[PDB]
Symmetry: C6
Subunit: 128 residues, 6 copies
Amino acid sequence: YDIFLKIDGIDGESMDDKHKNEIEVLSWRWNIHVSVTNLSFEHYIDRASPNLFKYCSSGKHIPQAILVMRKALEYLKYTFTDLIIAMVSPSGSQASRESIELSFSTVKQEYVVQGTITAGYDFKANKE
Amino acid sequence: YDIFLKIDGIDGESMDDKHKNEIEVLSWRWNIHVSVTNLSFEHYIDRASPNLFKYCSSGKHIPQAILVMRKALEYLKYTFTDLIIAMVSPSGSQASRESIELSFSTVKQEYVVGGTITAGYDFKANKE
Amino acid sequence: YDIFLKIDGIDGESMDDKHKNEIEVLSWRWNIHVSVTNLSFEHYIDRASPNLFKYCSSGKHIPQAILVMRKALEYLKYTFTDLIIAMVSPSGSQASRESIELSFSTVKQEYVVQGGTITAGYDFKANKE
Amino acid sequence: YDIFLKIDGIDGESMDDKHKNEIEVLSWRWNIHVSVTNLSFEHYIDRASPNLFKYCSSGKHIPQAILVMRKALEYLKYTFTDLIIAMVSPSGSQASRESIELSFSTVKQEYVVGGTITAGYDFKANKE
Amino acid sequence: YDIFLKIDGIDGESMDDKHKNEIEVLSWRWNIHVSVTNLSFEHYIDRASPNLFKYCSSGKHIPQAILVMRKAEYLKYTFTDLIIAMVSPSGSQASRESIELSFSTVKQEYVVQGGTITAGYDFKANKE
Amino acid sequence: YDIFLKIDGIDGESMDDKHKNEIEVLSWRWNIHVSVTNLSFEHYIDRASPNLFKYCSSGKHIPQAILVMRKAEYLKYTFTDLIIAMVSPSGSQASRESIELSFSTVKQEYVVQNGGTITAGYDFKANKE
């Protein structure tokens, strides 16, 4: 049950075959209330954290960003764009974890089945 | 125990005999106060998730919804008309749950026990 | 230890001796905030549920409903006159519950010590005993 | 660790000897700020619950009540004067509880050790 | 660990060789939000409880009270100008009473194993 | 899991060999929103709580504080123009003590263990890096 994430520019510490230097996500969350909530995710403190801090503190948009979930072979593809790192929130104690909120224009949701059933949408412009 | 629900259009991931391709449901909840509440429920991120995205994000209306409970033979059925996905919240950590809302108009409340006992109502049109 | 509620028309499922087809309550609370709180209680999903939904939806008057507590042997009895169903809050999970609130105007508390009875009553609409 | 509460007219159920027909308390509390808080306490549902409901329903002043903490032997006293029944919340679920609030105009504290340390106060009208 | 407290006026029940007749303090917390919260400590209901009532009821000024934590005496806390505001006895079948006091100065003296570090401030006088 | 914090003038009590008179930090956090949270860390009540007391109440400008994490020197943060907001001892029968810090600028320094180091910082009070 592994989660991964890719950002243009940013480069993670991940080390699997089909994709190296991804970000290793621990938990991902977001909602659709029509309005969209920011994407919230948590990871270790790792090599992206400086980049993350930076992207955030720079407001630099992000051409793409891709979330993936696979059970211990993947099956779930979350595809966000035009992305602005809202907040980075380090924290630690004697772990060190790191939550982030991001602000995206659109998202495509891919769900691969033993085929697929896809779904996306633009929020800055209400088109399927 | 065994909770299953149908949405016209939305198929689920059911492998069951008296209904396959139905949404396996984990929790459900709805209040009345007389303004009825959005119905909430929480399934695995499964094959309905992308369409639940859509019906939500389309704000499209649904012909019929039917909720079924039974034990570990179906005892409890809930039936609903003009359905509008109010909210959809997918999330995951290393469950992957998705907590959904639904605005509706009528509800039918059957229950196999005399045989059955049923009471309905329409909350837009105030009638039976 | 054992609670049974009895409402007019609306019928529980229970197969007791000293009651029958009565509502099997799993929890109740009520308060006197002189203001009176509504009563709430939570039973399984049982034959009374559409009735309560009906009576909640209709808002139709009920003459009375009666709650009784009992060991595990009666011992505690509440009587309430005049009743309107306010909130029904069913739910379920692969743990089927059903909250019910409801508004009344009078309460009679009947306590039967293990010897006599101690009773107290009131009317809230018309301040009276 | 026994707690017994004596209030005229309202009878508890205490099997004890140095005070029978006494409200077996299970929990209590009160502040001073300098408008005192109420007094909250909690007993099983008992013969006192009818006497405490009516007395709440009527709201009839109660002259004097006495509060006792003992050890598993009487060591702690409180004396409250001018007392009104404000709230009563019997819960039940297959403890069998009923919490109370009351309002005093004057409270006494008394505490035995090798001496006994005593103090009271009137609050409706401020004086010692 | 141990925590003892000695108040001008109020006699305790702790038996320590260096300082019997102090308050055996259970907990305590305080800040400088410059704005100072109250001291807020905790103790079993003991001989000090009536006098604290008296002071809390009578609002009488307390020149000084002194705070000690030692292991199972690194911390010495000094406060002056003290008044009793909250007092909250509460029982059940722990017999507790929390208190909050208002202090104009504090002197925080930390011993080291060595000597002491020393820290004091007049919030009212904004000096030291 | 070893977290140390070097503050200038506020001496420490930390018995480690790459650095002594260091603070033993228990837990820390902070949040960007641009707009930054204060710094937040916890420690026991130790030699620094008097030093940290004054720096708070007297509000003296801290040049710099340096925070490090390392496993049972891989993460560094540098904060400058610092002032102690609030001090908070407590304890009972752990003596805990949390403190909060307000920096003008922060650096962030992650050495990667085997090839490189990724770094990031910023001046907020003059919206610059």
